[PDB]
Symmetry: C3
Subunit: 684 residues, 3 copies
Amino acid sequence: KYERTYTTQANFILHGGDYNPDQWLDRPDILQADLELMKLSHTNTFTVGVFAWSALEPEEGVYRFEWLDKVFDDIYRIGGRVILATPSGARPAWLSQKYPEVLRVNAARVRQLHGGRHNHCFTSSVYREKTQHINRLLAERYGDHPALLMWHVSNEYGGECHCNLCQEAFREWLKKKYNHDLDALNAAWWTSFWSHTYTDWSQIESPSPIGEHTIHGLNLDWKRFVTDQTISFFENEIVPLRELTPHIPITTNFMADTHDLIPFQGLDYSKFAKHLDVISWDAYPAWHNDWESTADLAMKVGFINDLYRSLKQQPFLLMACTPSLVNWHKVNKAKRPGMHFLSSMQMIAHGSDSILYFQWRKSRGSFEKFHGAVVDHDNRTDSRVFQEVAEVGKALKKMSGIVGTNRPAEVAILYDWENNWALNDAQGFAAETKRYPQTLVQHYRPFWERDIPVDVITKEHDFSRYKLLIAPMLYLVSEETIARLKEFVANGGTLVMTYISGIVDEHDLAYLGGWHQDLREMFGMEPIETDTLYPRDRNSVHYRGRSYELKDYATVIKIHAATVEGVYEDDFYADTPAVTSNQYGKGQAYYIGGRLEDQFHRDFYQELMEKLDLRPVLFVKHEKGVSVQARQAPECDYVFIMNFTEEKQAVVLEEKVKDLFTGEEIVGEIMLDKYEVRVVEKRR
Amino acid sequence: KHLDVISWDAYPAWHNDWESTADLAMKVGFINDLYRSLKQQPFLLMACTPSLVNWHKVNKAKRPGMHFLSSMQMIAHGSDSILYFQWRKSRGSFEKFHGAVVDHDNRTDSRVFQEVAEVGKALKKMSGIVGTNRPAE
Amino acid sequence: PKYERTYTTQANFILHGGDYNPDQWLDRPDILQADLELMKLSHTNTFTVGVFAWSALEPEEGVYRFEWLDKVFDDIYRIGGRVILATPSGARPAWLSQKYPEVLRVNAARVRQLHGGRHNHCFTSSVYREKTQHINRLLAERYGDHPALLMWHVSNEYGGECHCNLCQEAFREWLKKKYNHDLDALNAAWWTSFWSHTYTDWSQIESPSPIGEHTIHGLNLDWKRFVTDQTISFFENEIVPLRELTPHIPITTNFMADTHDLIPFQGLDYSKFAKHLDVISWDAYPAWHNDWESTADLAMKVGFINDLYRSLKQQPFLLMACTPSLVNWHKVNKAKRPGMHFLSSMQMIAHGSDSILYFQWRKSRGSFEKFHGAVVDHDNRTDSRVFQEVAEVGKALKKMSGIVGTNRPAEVAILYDWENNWALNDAQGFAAETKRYPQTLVQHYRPFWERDIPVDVITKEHDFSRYKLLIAPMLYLVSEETIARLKEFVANGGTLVMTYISGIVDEHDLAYLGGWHQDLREMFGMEPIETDTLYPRDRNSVHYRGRSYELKDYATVIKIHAATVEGVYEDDFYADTPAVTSNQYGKGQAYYIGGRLEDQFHRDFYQELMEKLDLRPVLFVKHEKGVSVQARQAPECDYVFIMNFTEEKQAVVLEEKVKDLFTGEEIVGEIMLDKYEVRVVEKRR
Ligand SMILES: [Zn+2]
Ligand SMILES: [Zn+2]
C-alpha cells in the first residue's frame, strides 16, 4: 500500500512554467539572460509553444522551427525539461483570413471576427486538419528529444460554437444518443410543453437568446455535446502524438470559474479526464481580498485540488499560477511576502508534483503585460517576487521524495457537473441562492478545519473505499447512480444527502409519484416540499441541544423508519423533522433538510468523525486558520503545517518528527510566524 | 372593447421581504378594480397559482391559509372564477416547477391540494354571488 | 505685450444669448416676433443659428429654402445682435440617409445603423464630406459678407466612431503612413507576438471590436488616435469654403465634458483638435444641487475644466452652451436655484470666458429635448424666474466689456494627457474602479483652488518653461521626448511633482524595460520598484511633517538614491519605507508622491510649495472655504471675482481699497456675501 504512482518520468518536483521566447527572438541578449535566471531561480521545467503558431508557421506552409530547436537544446543543456504545447490555442491571422470557417458563431448567431484566443469552431474540418498537421510536425521533430517531458495540448479549452457545421454535428450527435428515435428525444425533453414537439431532425437547433432557450433537456444535452465535441477536437489533436510519441504523457490544463474559485462550468471535466494521462490546472486565487479571510480562500483552493486530484489515482500538476499578481481581476493585488511560498506548499500538500507559473517573463505589451511573472520588466533578480520564487525552488529540490506519493481518504464529497448545469438552468427555487459548488465547500469545511483528508469525487469514481460519502443537493441523479448509492449504504457506507437532492433524472425529467423507492428505503423518509426563502427570511433547527440558523432553503419531511435527529422551530412546519438518520443494511443514511450555519456542520460531522473514527494523517494541535495536510509514502508521511493567518500561531507536535529541510527533530509546541510553513517527515 | 369578458392572470409575490401582506393585497385590489371596470360586469380570474410560480427571483410558496385568502379577495373584487395554472405539474421543460393543483407525487395528501379543495368547497356555496356587481362612488 | 488683451472676435462686449432655432417656429410669426422683443428684455445679443437646420435649408435634394434664414439674419441685426452661424452637419436630412446609405455608421460590433438621432455620420464617407462641404459653401456665399456674422460654429459636438469598410481601409492607410509601411515596426510596437496575433498582411488589420479583437492595447490606442485624426480631417474638409470665402471670420467647434463628474471628453483628443481651431468653445452642464457633493466641490470641478480648455490656445475661450435652469438627460433633472445661474455665469467669466451662451433660447415644443432648459419656457412668460435671472446676467455683462480679451497668466501648471487617459483606462492591471486619472488631477488642483492661486491645466504640446511648478500625476504613458522636456524643465529651475503610476509605458503602450528611465531616476533621485493596488477596505498611512495621513487605492515601494525622504509608510510589509521624496536636480527640484493620500496631505504638501516658490493669488481676499476668488488681468487693472459657492452668508475681507465694477463705489474692509452672491471687483495697477 501507499505505493508511489508517477505522472511523468521526472523524479523531481517540476518548477518553472509558461515560457515564451517566441516573443523575444529579436532580443538574443534576453534569451541568453533567461537561461541564467532559470538557474538562479532554481526552475527546471518550462511549457513552450502555447501561442507560437504564427512563429512556427508565419505563412501557410512556411515553417520556422530553428528558434525552437535552439530553445530545446539550451534548456536541456542547463539541465532543464520541456513541456511541449500544441499551438491550437490561438490561430495565426493568415489562417482566419483565408479560412473563415474557423471563426466562432455565438449563441446569438453572430459570426465573430479574428481576435482573442481559445475561440475556434470546434467542428470546422479545416482547423482539425491544420491543428493535427502542425502537431504531427512537432511530434516528428521533437518527439525523441531528451528534454521533452510532456504534451500540453491546446490551452484552457472552453466556449461554444453555433455555426451551421456545429448545428449539423449536434443533430448527428442527437441521432446517436437517442438511437434515431425522435419520439424518445421528444419524451426526454418533454417538448409537448408549449407545442415544441419536433417532427424532423432538421428542426432541432442549439439554444439561443434569440431562439429557443426554454427547453431544459435541450440546454442540458447541448452542454453535453459541447463537452463531447471539445473532447473530439482534442482526440483529433493527439492522433499523431499517440502514433509518434506513445510514451509521452498527455495533459490539458483545467480551469476554475472566474469567480469564487468554483469548478469550471463550461466543460464536464469528469468526462474529459478519462481521455487524459494526467490532470493539470491553473489556479489564480484572489489572495488578500477584503471579503473573506485568508483561511476561507485557502479552504476553497484545497477543495478544488481535492476535486481535480481525485479524477485519477495519481498526483496532479499545477500547470499555472501567479508568483505575484494577475492582470484581469477587479483588484489586481500582489501576494504579500511569504504568501507565494505558502500557497505553493499548499499545492504540494494536496497532491501536486509541480509548481508551474504564468509567466516566466512579463510580456512587454498587449493584454497581459502586467500579469505576474518570475521576471519583471526591470529584468532584476533583486525583485521580491524573483527571490521568493527562488526560495520555493530551493525548497522543492529537497522534496523529491514526495514525487509520486498519494494520499488516501476515508471521506468523499460527490460533485456532478451535469447536476450543476441542470440546477443552474432550472426555473424554480432562487437563482442567487442555489450556490451548489459553494454548498459543497460548506460540507468540506469541518473536515478541512480538522485536517481530515477528503476526496472530491464524481459518479464514475468508486464509492466502496470510503467510510463516508457526502452528496449535497444531488438535484439531478440517474437510477444507476441511485442504485450504486443504495449498494454503498447497504454494504456499510455512511451517506449524507441534503435538501434538493434526487428531484430529477439525467434528462432533467421530474421523478413522479413521490421519491424513488430506493432513496426512500435508504433514508427511511422522503421530502414532500422544498421551501424557498427570501434573503431576510430565517428559521432554525434544534439539534443535539443547540439551535442553528437556517437560510435560503428548508424541506418538509415525511418520516417512515428514520430517526428524527433535528426539528424546525419556526414557520408552518415548526417542530417537524429537519435532520434524520436511518440504518440501512450494514450502513447508515443521513438527511439534512435545511441550509444551516457553519457550526451545525462542525457539530454534525464531529459526531461522524467520532462514530467512524475519522482522523488526520498526523494530529497537530492548532487554532483555526492553520491547515495540516499530508502525503503518504510507503516509508513515511510528509506533513505540511501551514499558517493561513496574519498572526503568530502556537501549534503542538504530539509526536516527534523531522524537519524535511534541516533534519532537526521537533516535538511539542512551536511558533509559526505569519504565513509560515513547516514541512516535517514522520517514519512509519 | 373587442372582448365579451375581461380575464387576467395574477401572480403576486406573497410573503416577500420588502413589504407587508396588506400592501401587496392592496396592490392586487387596485389591479382588480382596474380590470373589472373595463366593462360593466364581473370579470374572470383566468390564472393564478395555488402555491408558487417558477420565474420569480425567489419562488416562495403560499403559506397555509393564504390561497383561500387570496381566492376570496378575487371574488370580493368582482371575479366570478378561480382558475389556476396549472392543473397538473408538467414533468419537464420551463415550468415543470410551476405550482399546480397536483404535484409530481400525485398525492391528494398535499397541503396544496387540500386547500384547493377547501376553496372549491367554499365556492359551491357562493353561487348567489355569480353575476353580481359592485357600484362605486 | 504685458497683460495685453487678446480678442477672439470683433465683438468688444461679452456675448450673451445662445442657440436659436426659429426653423422650428416658421409657422408661428407671432412667436418669431416675440423672440426679438424678449431678446431685448433679456439683454441677449448673440445667437447660434442653423445647428440642426439642414432639412429646413434643404427639404429635398437641390431644393433650397434660404429666405427664413435671410430674415432671421436681418431681424437679429436690427436689434443690434450678432449671429454665430453654424454648419448643419450635426444632423443630416432623412432623404440624405435614404439616397446615400454610405453616410450611415457601422458600430464596433459591425452593425450598420439606421437613420436617426444626430452626430452619427460616417466620418470617412466621401459623399458626406462632399455634401457637407457643398452646403457650407452655400452658407458662406450667401451670408459671408453680412455684418451680423460673427463666427462659424462648425457641426455640433463631434463624437463617435465608424467601423465600416471605408473606415477600415482608411485606418489601414493611416497605419501605413504612421509606421512607414513597415509591418515589422507595427507588430513590434503592438507586441502582436502575444497570443499569436502577428500580422503578415495589412489587409488582416481591422478596428477593435467586442466580437473581434479587443485585447491588443496598441491597436486600441492607435484606433482612438485615428478616430481623432479623421474627425479632424472631416472638420478640415468642412471649413475649406469657410477659409476661402470668409478668411477673417473665426472658426470654432463646441467641446464637451464627459457625462459624469465633469471629466474631459474622452472620445476625442482635444489637445490635437485645438490647433485646428481659431478659438476654443465648450458646453457645460454641471449637475448643480446634487446630493453627492457640495456646491463648492462641483464648482471646483468646473474651474478645472475651464482652466484646461482655456490653456489650449492661451486666449479667452467661449462658453458655447449651458442651461439657464436645467437639462433633460440627467438621471435627476433638477433646476438651478435662485442666484445659482448668475453665480455660475460669473465663474465662467472669471476663468477666461468672453461669453455666456445658452442652450437654448426657446424651449422645443416636442421631441427629445422639449423639457430642456431655455430662456423662454412653454408659457412664453417674462415673469419666469429663469428669464429674469437671465436678464440679471445680461444686465451685469453689459457693464463688463473691459474684461473682454483679458488673460490670466499662471505660475502653476497641471499636466493632462488624453492618450495617457486612454492607455491607462484600457490597461489590464491596478484596479478598474480606482484608476480615476482626471479625478486625481482635480485632487492636486484642490489646494490651489482653495487658495485662489491661478492654475493652467496644460497638455504636452504646451510650453513648460514659463511655469514655476508643474504637477504631473499618474503620467502612466510618457514618451522619450516628453521625459527629455521634463528633464530640461527641472534642470533650468522648474519644480516638478509626479506620483504613483507615472512613466510606466511609452506612446505605444509598450512597457519600459530594465527598471525606470534613467532620466527620471536622475531627476527624482529615486525609483519605484512596485505598485501596490488595494481593495476598497484596505488602508495605509504616511507620516509626513509630524503628522499621519490616510492612504487608499495605491501605494508605491520606493528605492532611494540621492533623494531626501520626506514621508514614510506606517503599515503593511513596506512600513517605515519612503513614501514621499524630494530631490534637487540642476537649478530645480523634483517631488515624488508614492501614495494616494487624503485631501489634507495635498493641502499641507502644496502649502510648503506655495511658501517656497512665493505663489500668491492675483488679489488676496480673506474668506472661508467655499468662497472662490478668481481674476483676469488687464494692462491697467485686475478684474477680481469673489464668488460664494456656499448656501450660507459669508464674511469676506478686502485688504487693499478697491472699486466695485457695477456700482463704481470704492470698497474696503469686511464685506458680507449672501448665498450665491458674487462681487465683481476692480483693482488698478
Ligand atoms: Zn462551429
Ligand atoms: Zn465609416
